[PDB]
Design a protein around this ligand. Sequence first.
Ligand SMILES: CC(=O)O[C@H]1C(=O)[C@@]2(C)[C@H]([C@H](OC(=O)c3ccccc3)[C@]3(O)C[C@H](OC(=O)[C@H](O)[C@@H](NC(=O)c4ccccc4)c4ccccc4)C(C)=C1C3(C)C)[C@]1(OC(C)=O)CO[C@@H]1C[C@@H]2O
Ligand SMILES: Nc1nc2c(ncn2[C@@H]2O[C@H](COP(=O)(O)OP(=O)(O)OP(=O)(O)O)[C@@H](O)[C@H]2O)c(=O)[nH]1
Ligand SMILES: Nc1nc2c(ncn2[C@@H]2O[C@H](COP(=O)(O)OP(=O)(O)O)[C@@H](O)[C@H]2O)c(=O)[nH]1
Ligand SMILES: Nc1ncnc2c1ncn2[C@@H]1O[C@H](COP(=O)(O)OP(=O)(O)O)[C@@H](O)[C@H]1O
Ligand SMILES: [Mg+2]
Ligand SMILES: [Mg+2]
Lengths: 441, 429, 365
Amino acid sequence: MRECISIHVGQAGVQIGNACWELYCLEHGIQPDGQMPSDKTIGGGDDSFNTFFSETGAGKHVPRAVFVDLEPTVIDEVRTGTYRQLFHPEQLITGKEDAANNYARGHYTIGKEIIDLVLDRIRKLADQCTGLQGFLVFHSFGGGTGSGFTSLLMERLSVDYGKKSKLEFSIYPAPQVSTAVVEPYNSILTTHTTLEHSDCAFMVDNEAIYDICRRNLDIERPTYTNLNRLISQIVSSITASLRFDGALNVDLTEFQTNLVPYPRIHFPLATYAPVISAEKAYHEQLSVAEITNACFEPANQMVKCDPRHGKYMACCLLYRGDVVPKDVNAAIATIKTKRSIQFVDWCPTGFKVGINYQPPTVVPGGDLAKVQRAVCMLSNTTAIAEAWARLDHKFDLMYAKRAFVHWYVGEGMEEGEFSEAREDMAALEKDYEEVGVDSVE
Amino acid sequence: MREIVHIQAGQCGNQIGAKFWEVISDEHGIDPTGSYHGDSDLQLERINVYYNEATGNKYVPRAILVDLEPGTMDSVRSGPFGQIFRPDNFVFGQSGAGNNWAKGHYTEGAELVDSVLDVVRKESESCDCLQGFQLTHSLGGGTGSGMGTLLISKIREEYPDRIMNTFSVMPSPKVSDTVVEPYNATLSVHQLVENTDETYCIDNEALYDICFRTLKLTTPTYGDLNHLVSATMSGVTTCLRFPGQLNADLRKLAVNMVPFPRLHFFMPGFAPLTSRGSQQYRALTVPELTQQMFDSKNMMAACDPRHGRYLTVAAIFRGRMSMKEVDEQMLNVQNKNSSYFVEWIPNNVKTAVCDIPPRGLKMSATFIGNSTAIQELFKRISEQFTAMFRRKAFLHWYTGEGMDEMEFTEAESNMNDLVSEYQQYQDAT
Amino acid sequence: KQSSISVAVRVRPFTEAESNRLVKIDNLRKIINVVDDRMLIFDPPETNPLTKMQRNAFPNSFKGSRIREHRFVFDRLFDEDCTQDQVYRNTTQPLLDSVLDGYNATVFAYGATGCGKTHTISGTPEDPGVIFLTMKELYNRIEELKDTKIIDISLSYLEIYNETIRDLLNPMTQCKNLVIREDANNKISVSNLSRHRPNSVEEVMQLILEGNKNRTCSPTEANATSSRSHAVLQINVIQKDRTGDITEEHTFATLSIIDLAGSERAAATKNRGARLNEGANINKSLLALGNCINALCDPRRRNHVPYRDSKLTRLLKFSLGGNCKTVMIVCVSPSSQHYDETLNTLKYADRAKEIKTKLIRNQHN
Ligand SMILES: CC(=O)O[C@H]1C(=O)[C@@]2(C)[C@H]([C@H](OC(=O)c3ccccc3)[C@]3(O)C[C@H](OC(=O)[C@H](O)[C@@H](NC(=O)c4ccccc4)c4ccccc4)C(C)=C1C3(C)C)[C@]1(OC(C)=O)CO[C@@H]1C[C@@H]2O
Ligand SMILES: Nc1nc2c(ncn2[C@@H]2O[C@H](COP(=O)(O)OP(=O)(O)OP(=O)(O)O)[C@@H](O)[C@H]2O)c(=O)[nH]1
Ligand SMILES: Nc1nc2c(ncn2[C@@H]2O[C@H](COP(=O)(O)OP(=O)(O)O)[C@@H](O)[C@H]2O)c(=O)[nH]1
Ligand SMILES: Nc1ncnc2c1ncn2[C@@H]1O[C@H](COP(=O)(O)OP(=O)(O)O)[C@@H](O)[C@H]1O
Ligand SMILES: [Mg+2]
Ligand SMILES: [Mg+2]
């Protein structure tokens, strides 16, 4: 009855989606071929909820997902993988050529000739949805497709569906680590064209997750599989309230209401506290208070910033498993007494709490321990302003020389648009500076 | 399905191409008969990038073999893999260009370019989507220089929106193999800057130095130089035909590495390279791969990066490895060697990772650098050029073929402008 | 001896549709307030009463819009109601006086698409532009100087299209045979141009009309007749004395008139395919020109000016390098719908006011 449509854009989006749908299938008992063997014990039962999986007459469960990367390699890895029989064959490739880390290509030149097909498939998938809530868009700043085509898709979805929630899971560029030299241009242009259309953008950083895996999980050499598994756990924590019973439910429209004070500052950070190996799962209690304290440690944040350099505007704590509301109350009360954790005066409330009975799954072949309770946190802070400013400085250092700019104007873009984007980014910075100021009367 | 059309011009281009088709055919499990006998199923799923299917699961290279001396074509035919090439793609004349750029560009090459372009059009229009062309040739020789530049110009006219990939052997600093090397090299560079997206500069003395110093070879024939170059050419397009954690096609490399349109002359490298005996003493890991990869002594262009600044480098890894190691190493190299990277590009390293290593290796890496030190190449040629052009040392062999002195002057001016631009971006803040 | 590059700005009038919408809304907004011949205000304040009422009770809590106008100063400004003669008298007549004195000169048009560059330079049969007036006055002054000096005109007219040169007065000449070659003294010397020799107003205007007929032009939804090429007209005027005592006082000069294709915005355009490719090439050429402007303005970049990034900048090298008086006509559209592009066309123009060159009178024989 409830449902949401996941959209995976680019290589990062597709691989995160692979992790996410592996986790979902394990959570609901779906086999890789789409069959649910739990029907052999409880015929007609509901272990696979139709928030994500559409059921056919034969008993096959089809995920409500759309995959796009403008390149055949990543999707072809799915079509010949272990989950080839799960997804509908309409996994979309306009890969006659990729975007080449170019915003213009994935938005103006090659982003067209696929957009109509993608929106047609999204329309077909939504027409089966009796009570669609919103879209979960997975992409990455810095790529060609993930920036440009995601901006175009968000622009078209804002017209086709209007006041429908559009949550984004985006890979922010790291302060130091990067795999391309044109990440600032793509990120700035994406943000400029995306601010007016998204409702809430959950942000993670690969460098921070590398640090988390190194310190907490004792993985010296993590690949993207570990990062995608952690992001999958976070997404599962966010969407658990639509699927399983709980003491306190959270709908998809609740996140934007609670985490977004003003329209232009909808950039919360995400973190997942009980990241621990099986060996270190012993020797600790992993109580509600300890995990909630771990949520607020700067070391455990998944965006390379420090909340201590700013003020908390909003916080949303989603609990899973053997969690009692009294313990959550005591933990948040303990957090509110810390002088190192500041909140803006215009928000004396701060916290939202959700509680769910379903604990997380083990994902065999993974690295996380089987903890019997867990917490995800979504925190909107002003410290993210720093993470913006660095990009802006980087942008300037290139744009003063017009480095790599000809690749963008060679695909239909006008030079002045660069400046216009940067200016919109300046205003955004100022907005943060105006938001985190003590009021007077 | 991205597809590449491969053009071979001159003796040097043809030998490099023969070795390269040997390497690629071994990579995809294609035998000298054109039939498949490999093991992995990933070898066929992107065979279309370089091969066409003919009848009996026979795979024919999408190669075009060009020369003006018939001997090279007979040498290619009688080689181990001479029987896989399409017989109609052997386009060749009778008399060579005479180590004369004008003969191969205006007089002799002009009479044979039409057949080559007919074959190019036949091969290019038989693809679902052409990614681009790649040409292997040499500067400092008649047929390679002249025909390669003429073909590049005409293909650019016909196909302005596709990638052009020139793997070229430049004149060497100490010893030359032609008396009139500076004229051909200057005119070739003048034609290359205006009609190519990326040029991979190779120098024979750098390859000799690598073979003697690193591989401990005492008789490095041209087969070994072709081996090294062929490994580089395979490394460049690895992500086009195999899956990986982080892909990168030719256009992405061109976008990330060419900050300004005319600065597209690159310095390649390959790792690991060890002697047959010293392999057992070395642990093959990413920290060692990147250490060898960024070494000044491993570059293939005989131009020291340490005399300039890197505008942008690209590293393409192959094999199962962690992303954290690659990111940390490409950050540590920049942090430790910050004086050798331009400070107005915040991140000078492009990274790509492919999951399928070469056949006998567990790990490999390909370097493609773009640095201002490449000016030391052009400057040298320019000096030699003017030393011959002041006295008109050999001009009557070129003006006798219909060339004007204005072409020489324009080529010299263009190369000097390129040198000036490189010097500007070296000394900047 | 120094000479600065003068910048004149022209504001085109509203189209019929835009005029209707703006007039109804005012009863859409004019965003360029021409307050003086040398001074305009871009997006002036107090021209939107709803914004005034909202900001009067919104003390800078958030921006949501522009906070402060832009103030621009140029050599001369032309409003919507200007005619062709006023532009001609104050933009290029001194340049013709200079070319007939012995100093090279150029006038070139820049701006966004649909701003009135071809109208300013070429015009229409019922409203001639700069070229018609300039040639008419040139030949009139020739008739004035008859029996005192011998004046010879050599006319050349080419276009840059997709980084290829075409001779507008001699079609069927292949693009491969038109190449730019710098000699030992850095003279441009485009190869294989017609170099026609008119001797009357009727001949020169017929020749120029035949040239204009061969320009590449197609609809692009910004205007039904959009130029897709950079058109360059060169007029070499050579003056000899009739005394017979021929000395170094023989003179020769060049008047250049250049119409540039317009910048196409990406966020607000519907041009897909070959039109978009042409716009991409035009944008590349204009970016190269902008790089040349920035390099010439900055003392720190004097080691290298990227003239060779495009053929347009190479043909414009002579103007900015030395020995030429330069006029830039910057065309703008005064509407909020074109807020973004216009700003850039103003901002670039501002930088272009800082270029200075050295002029030397030409002598021959
Ligand atoms: C221990 C072992 O198995 O022997 C190795 C070997 O000893 C070393 C020294 C090999 C060896 O290479 C050389 O001896 C050599 C000689 C001249 C020029 C270049 C190399 C080797 O020949 C090369 C050969 O490499 C391959 O098979 C790659 O897949 C390579 N193949 C070809 O080039 C090829 C040549 C002819 C016919 C078919 C394929 C390749 C590299 C990059 C991209 C695609 C393919 C390997 C593993 C070895 C030997 C056999 C000794 C090295 O080769 C490369 C380029 O990978 C040289 O340093 C490396 C590291 C290896 O340890
Ligand atoms: N966390 C995570 N990040 C990834 C993964 N794959 C790619 N990325 C990141 O994605 C960023 C760039 O995006 P791309 O890999 O180029 O994908 P894209 O957005 O489709 O760009 P194009 O391939 O050019 O179309 C890089 O900074 C990578 O670190 C992944 O599996 N997990
Ligand atoms: N790497 C490599 N270079 C070669 C080879 N043969 C010739 N060369 C180089 O090519 C140049 C000679 O040009 P060449 O191709 O023989 O002239 P052409 O036959 O008229 O085209 C010299 O500078 C050589 O160093 C080869 O087999 N391998
Ligand atoms: N000052 C002006 N007066 C009257 N019409 C004008 C003026 N400027 C532009 N126009 C109109 O704009 C239309 C298209 O302008 P055009 O000059 O072709 O654009 P571009 O400058 O891009 O070539 C013409 O039909 C012309 O009538
Ligand atoms: Mg991709
Ligand atoms: Mg026009």
